[PDB]
Amino acid sequence: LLVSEGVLKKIAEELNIEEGNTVVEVGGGTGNLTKVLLQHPLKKLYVIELDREMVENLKSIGDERLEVINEDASKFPFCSLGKELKVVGNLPYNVASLIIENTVYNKDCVPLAVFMVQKEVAEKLQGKKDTGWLSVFVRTFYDVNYVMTVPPRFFVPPPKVQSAVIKLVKNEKFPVKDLKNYKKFLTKIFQNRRKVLRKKIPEELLKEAGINPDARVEQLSLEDFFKLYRLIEDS
């Protein structure tokens, strides 16, 4: 996705960059976002990028603050790099969900993330439409704020895609001990959308959490997930 200077400026602005910040850009294609980020007084900018052509583009930028890391942003442990990291990226559609999930695993060191994603992905994460496990996983740890609507640009070849900028702001709503276990919990409850919760979770447990056993996962609120999870979380 080629992005306008105005939209790129907004994205960088949403990070609220100040002196001493470490920013982590997830993807380096193209270095237009990189250049805009470097117009702010950040201390260090990590760019997580593997693509050889995209890494060549970054090489020509001589800024001492820029360090390219050749790894997969969908699998990279961000917290291995720093205790406080602002994460940003114009995310490709095939990896956007995996990158966002990975950011969440690293919630302990990511106070703020700003992403451009497809419109439908933004809507899902906010819990507005077709809410899936990832939406609940994110919102357990972040507020998902809608920042910008990014319609397809006029001079872009088909297929025309509607995008949005979203901002994840740290706001932990449950002190989950084991994120991997929490993901399992969410994936189990969302699996087989058509099946009533009775058929996935023991009725007695649902009743104890104040959940209708004959509800579909669509009926659950954020608080519902927490009410049920505190009942099964190991001590």
Side-chain angles (χ1 to χ4, degrees):
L1 188 74
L2 193 69
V3 177
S4 70
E5 283 301 297
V7 168
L8 287 180
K9 281 175 174 46
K10 182 89 196 163
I11 286 161
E13 182 185 313
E14 283 301 324
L15 294 164
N16 302 305
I17 294 157
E18 54 175 290
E19 193 184 330
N21 285 170
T22 300
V23 180
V24 179
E25 185 191 2
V26 289
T30 181
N32 289 354
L33 179 55
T34 301
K35 277 173 98 171
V36 175
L37 294 168
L38 289 170
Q39 292 179 6
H40 288 263
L42 53 80
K43 178 178 168 194
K44 193 155 189 200
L45 175 59
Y46 291 105
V47 176
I48 317 303
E49 179 58 71
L50 280 155
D51 191 77
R52 193 212 147 80
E53 212 147 23
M54 294 176 192
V55 165
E56 287 301 304
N57 300 328
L58 294 162
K59 285 325 179 191
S60 53
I61 309 169
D63 205 303
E64 59 183 32
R65 300 170 297 159
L66 178 68
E67 185 170 320
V68 185
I69 285 161
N70 304 323
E71 254 137 347
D72 184 9
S74 72
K75 303 268 178 52
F76 190 73
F78 304 132
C79 296
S80 68
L81 293 178
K83 302 284 276 199
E84 197 226 304
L85 310 169
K86 297 187 168 170
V87 177
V88 55
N90 169 194
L91 305 184
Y93 72 73
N94 62 356
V95 290
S97 297
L98 287 313
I99 294 172
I100 295 168
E101 178 189 351
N102 197 43
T103 300
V104 181
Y105 285 125
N106 290 277
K107 58 99 182 166
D108 288 341
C109 68
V110 176
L112 175 58
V114 175
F115 296 120
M116 186 162 273
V117 291
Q118 296 208 169
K119 179 168 106 77
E120 73 175 43
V121 168
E123 299 175 336
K124 292 185 202 195
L125 297 179
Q126 287 179 276
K128 280 174 184 303
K129 185 178 175 176
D130 298 318
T131 304
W133 74 270
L134 181 56
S135 174
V136 176
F137 191 65
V138 176
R139 288 178 295 126
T140 301
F141 309 99
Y142 294 94
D143 296 332
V144 179
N145 301 296
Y146 193 90
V147 167
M148 166 134 331
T149 291
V150 187
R153 305 180 68 202
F154 188 85
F155 293 102
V156 183
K160 297 296 206 294
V161 157
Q162 285 272 327
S163 297
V165 177
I166 58 172
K167 182 168 178 176
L168 306 190
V169 174
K170 176 62 85 68
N171 178 29
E172 187 171 283
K173 306 185 186 63
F174 189 89
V176 174
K177 297 173 198 165
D178 182 335
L179 290 156
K180 299 200 177 206
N181 191 79
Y182 188 53
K183 169 167 177 194
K184 196 186 281 199
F185 161 76
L186 295 178
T187 50
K188 282 165 170 292
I189 191 153
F190 279 91
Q191 270 297 321
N192 305 291
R193 176 154 273 148
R194 265 46 196 167
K195 286 192 175 173
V196 295
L197 301 171
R198 270 198 310 122
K199 290 184 170 188
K200 315 185 204 192
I201 334 284
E203 299 176 25
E204 30 280 311
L205 196 84
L206 291 168
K207 286 180 266 191
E208 191 174 12
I211 301 172
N212 173 16
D214 294 308
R216 280 172 46 146
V217 70
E218 263 137 294
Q219 191 184 297
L220 301 189
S221 63
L222 215 52
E223 184 178 56
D224 290 319
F225 291 96
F226 311 149
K227 277 182 185 181
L228 190 72
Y229 195 65
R230 65 168 288 278
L231 303 180
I232 71 177
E233 197 184 32
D234 80 308
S235 63

